[PDB]
Amino acid sequence: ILDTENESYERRVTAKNLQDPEDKTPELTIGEAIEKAFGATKKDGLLYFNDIPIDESCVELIFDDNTANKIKDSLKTLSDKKIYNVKLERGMNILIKTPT
Amino acid sequence: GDTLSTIKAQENQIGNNLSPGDTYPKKGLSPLALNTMDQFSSRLIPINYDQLKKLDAGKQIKLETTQVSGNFGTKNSSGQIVTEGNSWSDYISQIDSISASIILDTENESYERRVTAKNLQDPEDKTPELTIGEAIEKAFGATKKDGLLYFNDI
Amino acid sequence: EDLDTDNDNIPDSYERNGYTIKDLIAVKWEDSFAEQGYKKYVSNYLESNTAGDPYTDYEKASGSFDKAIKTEARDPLVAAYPIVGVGMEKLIISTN
Amino acid sequence: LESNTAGDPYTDYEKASGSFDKAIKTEARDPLVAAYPIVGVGMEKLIISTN
Ligand SMILES: [Ca+2]
Ligand SMILES: [Ca+2]
User: Fold this and answer.
1) Which of B36, C12, C24, D2 could lock C45 by a disulfide, CB 3.0 to 4.6 Å apart?
2) Phi, psi of A30 (to 5 degrees)
3) Coiled coil located at which positions (chain D) (predicted)?
């Protein structure tokens, strides 16, 4: 969900579960999933919708409690430790609000 | 500033035929009444005392069209024109989405045409590119004399 | 290749290696269409509908569905899913 | 170039040969004329029940 001024967007993105291998859906990181489900544009590594950037250091990004727990569990077991590189999982209610 | 009620013409106010440029109560007859509210044409539109007092005080009550539903006519294997389950509502959204509107407001008349426009954002749409003037000429049947557009004499 | 385990029009080698749809047919991706407008779709080759929406992978990729769907719902991974909601404006209470 | 010259449901051959409905006036036999009823309603008089 994106909550820009006087507008909203409520996209859905497919996610793959690794607990029982028969699904062959490609694995999507959250950042490229956002840029895929929103038609965003890349300049040199930043995401722009029309003229408002969307990035971990430029937006207010809020999870649910379960989603935040899943994110935390999948960050200390990595190296970059940046959210926009976290494997997507089913049942993740992200919410992005751009600054005023 | 508060809507009174929304009503859909159930059975006694359905226009069987509407040709372009012609009203449903063809000119010469009288307008049609709209009183019943429920589905089986058995009810009257009720208003309460405050709204009646506002009506009698001098306030004006307006009617605004919200939507219209109606079929079109196709041909089956025979030469029989069929109009059943052919609701224009199936195409309204797409036509408004992929086309641009052009309105003309000559005296005691109006024209509300739609012209297809191509977007250059994805190299899959292959609709020919139309300029505004030649789109007007194409969508209005206008005539060119030496570089000017005439509809009939204006 | 030529295998089609899902019976759509996209074979199960492009369906997982990357394909683009031009002239209503699927072709391999080589990044040369990068600076032209074409996108790169990747889907699942064991199901007809990757996302779950009624339109299939080929219909979503080519653009043969209802022409009022936003381009963000173009690639198979994204799903066409309206979120229709009701916003209340006011009340009028008739006192009988 | 058209199956129905006039526009009425019956085609040219059906109208010409008379293989169509037999209650239609002979003036509609030729394709140029159209089989088209002009049914109208004539009022006679009202009765008002005063409740
Ligand atoms: Ca396939
Ligand atoms: Ca597939």
Assistant:
1) C12
2) -70, -35
3) none
